[PDB]
Amino acid sequence: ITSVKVVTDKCTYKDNELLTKYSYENAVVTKTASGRFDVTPTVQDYVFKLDLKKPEKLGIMLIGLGGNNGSTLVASVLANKHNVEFQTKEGVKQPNYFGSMTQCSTLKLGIDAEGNDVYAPFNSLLPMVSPNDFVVSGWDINNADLYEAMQRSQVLEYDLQQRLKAKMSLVKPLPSIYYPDFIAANQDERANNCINLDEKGNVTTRGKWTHLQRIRRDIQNFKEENALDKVIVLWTANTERYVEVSPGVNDTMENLLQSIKNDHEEIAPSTIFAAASILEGVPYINGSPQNTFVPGLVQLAEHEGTFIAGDDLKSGQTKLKSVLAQFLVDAGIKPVSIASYNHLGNNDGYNLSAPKQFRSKEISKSSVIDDIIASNDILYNDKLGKKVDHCIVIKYMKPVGDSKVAMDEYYSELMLGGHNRISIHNVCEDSLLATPLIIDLLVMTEFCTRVSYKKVDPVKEDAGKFENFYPVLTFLSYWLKAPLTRPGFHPVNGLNKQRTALENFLRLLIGLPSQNELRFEERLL
Amino acid sequence: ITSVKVVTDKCTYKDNELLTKYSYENAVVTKTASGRFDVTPTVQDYVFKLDLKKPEKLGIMLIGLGGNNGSTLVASVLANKHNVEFQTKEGVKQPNYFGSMTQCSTLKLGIDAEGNDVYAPFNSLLPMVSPNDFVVSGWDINNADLYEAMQRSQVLEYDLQQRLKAKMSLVKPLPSIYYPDFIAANQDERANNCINLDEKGNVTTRGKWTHLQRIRRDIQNFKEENALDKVIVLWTANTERYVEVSPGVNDTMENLLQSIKNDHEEIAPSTIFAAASILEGVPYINGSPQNTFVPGLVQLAEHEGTFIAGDDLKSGQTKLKSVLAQFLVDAGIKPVSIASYNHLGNNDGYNLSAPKQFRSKEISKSSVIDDIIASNDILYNDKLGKKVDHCIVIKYMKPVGDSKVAMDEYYSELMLGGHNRISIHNVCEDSLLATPLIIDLLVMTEFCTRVSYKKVDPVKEDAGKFENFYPVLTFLSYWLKAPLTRPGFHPVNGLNKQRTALENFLRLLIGLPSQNELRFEERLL
Amino acid sequence: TSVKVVTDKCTYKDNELLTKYSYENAVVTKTASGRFDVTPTVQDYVFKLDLKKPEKLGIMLIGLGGNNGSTLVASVLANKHNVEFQTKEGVKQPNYFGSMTQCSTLKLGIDAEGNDVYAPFNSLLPMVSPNDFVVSGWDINNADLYEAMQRSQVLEYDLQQRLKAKMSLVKPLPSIYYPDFIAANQDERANNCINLDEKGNVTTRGKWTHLQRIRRDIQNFKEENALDKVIVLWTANTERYVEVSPGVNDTMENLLQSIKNDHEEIAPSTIFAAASILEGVPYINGSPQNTFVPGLVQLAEHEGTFIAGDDLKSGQTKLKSVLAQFLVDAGIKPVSIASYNHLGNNDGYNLSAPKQFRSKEISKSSVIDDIIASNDILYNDKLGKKVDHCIVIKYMKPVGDSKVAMDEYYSELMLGGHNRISIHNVCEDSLLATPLIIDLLVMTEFCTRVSYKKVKFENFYPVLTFLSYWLKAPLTRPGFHPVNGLNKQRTALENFLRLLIGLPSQNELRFEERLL
């Protein structure tokens, strides 16, 4: 087993709880008309409390359980949990969670006697739940069991699917909420496991509040049937179209709940699942690009004090773009044109073949570089131009299956008329990439539910009571394309910066300062 | 000077005319229900007559003279004609016609004493007009002179544009026909050199027959002002939308001419230019993808006996695709997915940014592989599947200017589950590629106008009188995406096969048989 | 599916086909003034094709246990026995995709509408099918072909398992291992050798005895399976070129003498070729080494045996000649062509050594020189007649048999412009090489049943240059420079099959449409 023991007086343990002192420093800046930056440092002391008693089993309810991601996730959990080795043309392979930052990445704890960097597993600093301990279920408008789902998805090695056949076959998605207008028309035939059916047994968008009540009961039922204490809900179903946000409809906690009861046409299935999970006090993670978290819902989460988070998985082309575009601008290079083409032949691409669904994705896959452009007015300004041409294209090409092909070109300006042209061709099993990210989101969300804190008054000992994270868990931004933010704050998409936040967080809970990379043990005599 | 002298009794010269005997062989095939192919060879003897008196100057009237292709063509002609060397970062460069199959490709005439292949310039077999002898003019809805056109286009080296400044500045496009509905709305501001203006001086699609009469007079005027004997019209203006072909409108020579007089809404500017050139007996070449040659026009060409030809320039991505896809299928490999993405930032891409214009291009850029799939039912059939997923994408990205970036992926099947994935990134100055192809089309069209023939009756000497090529010059298919064909016949897009046709044609006029590649001087003792 | 041409150029005489053919061409000379004098030439011929093809064709592969050898056997068994297999994309049916003789078609003529009619490449004249191949061969490693398959990691696991029972039965015969002719690492792999001394050790002494043993292996294979026709093909690791010296291997008599003299320039492939020639069986060299030294070519001529080869024209080199040719035919001037490649199979491992790779760097390069030379408008002393070119092959084990090829064509356009085409080609190398081997065997067998006479029948000059479509280093007749234009190379084959059934070469003139 891997564990870390930090010798610090900032940390004490009391009844399965770790208490850690932390002085958070930042700075408020102002810019003079002239052009001077006045920086006022700041400080706020805290005491973080970490419940060390992690759950032995964590309930996981996926919406879209029968899809590529859904079936692959269950498969990865079963395969790893039971060490289901499988045959391939490269020979027997041992199951693993490669692609999981939470399960397969490491972090620098410090330097050793010789002065060489020492790294430890990301999940070895503080107690985290293992995906091998996930008890998974969920919903799907299609009733195929999970073995059929695997076959249909064509993601996993034939031999592996066969070894998981027996178990996967017994896993059946619960009927779900199907409202025809929110997803592509071509998914119509797929919908045969719906709870919203009229007297004639047909699909009906009538009775949206009864649906909400069923989903909540589904969560309660699942939990007790498994003797679980905690459950997390994650949406990994078809990308819906955006819903119109309007006053009196979904702008407030009150208008939203009412619109739901009135069956407003701008209440999507995700709106119902989110509202249900929130009302049950269950973390809800949105893995798709639609704007499920309209003002009224966020408001409901804040009021209920329930974790919400998400907006599309940042797994391939966009993940790398949030690394490459950052890199270029940090180097003083000016990207002026970024073309991103994509084609896949799975159900994800089949649904996204329709404009209303594609537009959702198109928006989240573009937003990722906006903050980058904004951070540098030396390169991007009115005099030199502050725009970067950016196009996102997603075409459905059945023959490539789940292996999305991403082709991008970054055309940038260098000094004295020069240019830099970086062409990319990125191929990979989209689900094998996404699945571990879904695992990361659940692992980190669960970790977050066991964290609380309280401001420390310098001139008054033991003031304030512990609070929980502000409802919107921005700490999970690393795994999302369009980071949901707190009202007023702008999102930051820099991948490396998003991971650093997670790193320093774990580091501070065990009493370590943030990474500085100064290495004065070397640079100074 | 380069010239070829073939010792053959099949060729005689009489008063600046070459007379050549040729026995054309082919074969008619039938397929038995059982599955046998009955092949009946055929033969038809001919006597081809080639007018050797090529014109000293060839009139060239481009529609879209002020565009990227138009200005570049005039520039290339001026630069080469006057040996205008220019400065670059790689040093002084000498003008040339690289990219011109007609000016820079060679053909194998035979083998030498040692048995080694001997090649001669494509234009050295028989007298052809030099582009240095082109007298160019034309029309454009924009009045900018050709120097401004060059600056605006940003295709040529700054130093070269400057050396051509004086001459190019004096070249001004003639006002043209602007009908707002046929091209992108964004070209509206560009239109300020129109002949179709009402009393108020505004653009009017009224009086389409007067426009036709003006264009014809334009051709007559241009010709006499330059003391020219021959002129060729070539459309290199914005891609128009397709026009609806309907009975009583543009299905016959008669309905078309009437619709023109009635100002039918399905009579585009290209329809007018084509009709005008045909009525003037001037070859008309369509360098864009719109369906300018509706049944009624082709009928008018046949009746007038005037050369027509075209439908989009096959210059880059599509040219290479007509080589690569052919190659794969000839090798028994089965392409199943071909994704073609493209982005450019010139006016061509700005206009194509609108769906109605893009659809025209999209159709011609796809058609190129249909004949290939059809030729092999071993690979493409009902049992194995006879479809090849193919998508064409064109995005406008201003920062790349005239340097179109073409990205394609050919995903094919190999035996026993294998696949082959060929990714491509093709960059180039689109106009530097297209321009020489426009030059080729004009050079070959002019050559064709000096060719006639007559069937030879074996049992009756001197029967029949000379005829000219069937109106639709399919021999130019090498330079076009969607080869216009004779009613009933299907087009062949194989690039290498298209060039071979041109090669064997020139070869037969000087008394040589088609290339067989048997080399029995080597393979046999 | 069959073809029946109504022509008076072909007469059948009991499994015999006689076809008349006038071969036209032309001889050219150039005047100082720059005038080309062309004199047409014609030579009449009569071809005879023995229509009686073998019902079973013996195939002996040197390197039978490698990627190509094992995949070849698997494809034959899989197709022959319709072994469908499971994949994550579902059940797939076996086929010979990638094979020109089995999966490409040819245009026979036009229909009543004026549109092209195509027929299977192997449907014009009787050709042996790969399903009727009886395969055996040698290998320095004794692993059975099932183990060979697993080792190769070329085929779908389920297909390997469905073929396990049959493939296990196939084991390679011991072979000749002369250490110095290949990459060191191919050492402890050599556990199956006939060349051993009275101590049991691998030796290069007694080369004539080795030769005699290969002939016996060939005779036994024939008798053992009651086969009349057998073809041998080298698909074993690339050897290091041998030096051709006078009296050593410059002639038929010297060559044989040097073999008996255990001469150091007598390579294992040299012996398999000599043995095959003596047994009268066609020998195909699927590797870059210069197996066919002068003395060896004389032996082939003398025995009237067909030889052919010098490296299996791989996909890249194949597509590279096509693109380069295409550019130059369009009047575009490539000025730089860079080729980088990496694979992780034994082939790549063996080529990781300079002497093995060097052989391959010689063949794949010469192809663009033909192109440069074909156009003095673009390539001349005034504008420059050179084209920078580089071929790099690195061993990257992890990519296994899936060779990755990365090329970049940089060309000049008019008035200072440029065209940059960069490619990234990936594929299971052996899934492309296997079918190419099937084509070579099928076409070599066909050529052996063809004889001709100008105007007693004679045979196809030892070197079957007709197979250049599948070989990177086209072996040619003395004095003649090899041609590599893939499309031209396929044209030759197409027209050959056409002339045998009385059809002229394709002209693409389509006068039924172009003329009134």
Ligand SMILES: NC(=O)C1=CN([C@@H]2O[C@H](COP(=O)(O)OP(=O)(O)OC[C@@H]3O[C@H](n4cnc5c(N)ncnc54)[C@H](O)[C@@H]3O)[C@@H](O)[C@H]2O)C=CC1
């Ligand atoms: N596989 C491909 O795509 C291409 C292969 N080639 C040629 O074919 C050869 C084989 O290719 P692969 O099957 O991929 O390689 P491989 O490495 O799997 O096959 C060679 C292995 O070495 C053994 N071997 C070495 N020396 C031998 C000898 N003296 N007698 C008998 N067996 C011997 C066997 O041939 C064994 O299978 C290469 O070395 C090369 O010359 C050429 C172009 C492409």
Ligand SMILES: NC(=O)C1=CN([C@@H]2O[C@H](COP(=O)(O)OP(=O)(O)OC[C@H]3O[C@@H](n4cnc5c(N)ncnc54)[C@H](O)[C@@H]3O)[C@@H](O)[C@H]2O)C=CC1
């Ligand atoms: N696949 C990837 O790598 C990534 C996936 N995502 C997103 O995750 C989602 C799922 O992706 P995949 O698994 O590939 O797609 P998928 O189409 O295979 O799976 C989605 C599943 O959701 C079900 N479904 C649709 N609407 C539903 C509803 N209202 N209630 C319950 N079930 C419903 C469908 O029947 C289907 O089985 C999509 O929105 C996709 O864009 C985002 C980034 C990356």
Ligand SMILES: NC(=O)C1=CN([C@@H]2O[C@H](COP(=O)(O)OP(=O)(O)OC[C@H]3O[C@@H](n4cnc5c(N)ncnc54)[C@H](O)[C@@H]3O)[C@@H](O)[C@H]2O)C=CC1
């Ligand atoms: N540029 C290339 O490499 C190739 C070009 N083509 C086609 O050739 C055409 C021209 O291309 P570019 O020169 O790049 O575009 P461009 O936009 O620069 O030039 C076209 C010119 O035509 C003029 N024009 C538009 N409608 C007109 C009308 N009714 N009458 C007269 N003038 C009119 C415009 O004012 C403009 O100056 C387009 O349809 C393009 O798609 C096709 C294949 C390749």
Ligand SMILES: O=P(O)(O)/C=C/[C@@H](O)[C@@H](O)[C@H](O)CCO
């Ligand atoms: O590879 P990315 O840009 O990080 C993620 C991309 C995802 O949106 C895609 O897989 C999407 O679901 C399919 C269409 O491309």
Ligand SMILES: O=P(O)(O)/C=C/[C@@H](O)[C@@H](O)[C@H](O)CCO
């Ligand atoms: O490069 P291609 O496919 O041969 C020709 C492509 C031409 O249609 C393009 O330049 C088109 O005008 C612009 C949009 O791509």
Ligand SMILES: [Mn+2]
């Ligand atoms: Mn997926």
Ligand SMILES: [Mn+2]
């Ligand atoms: Mn252009």
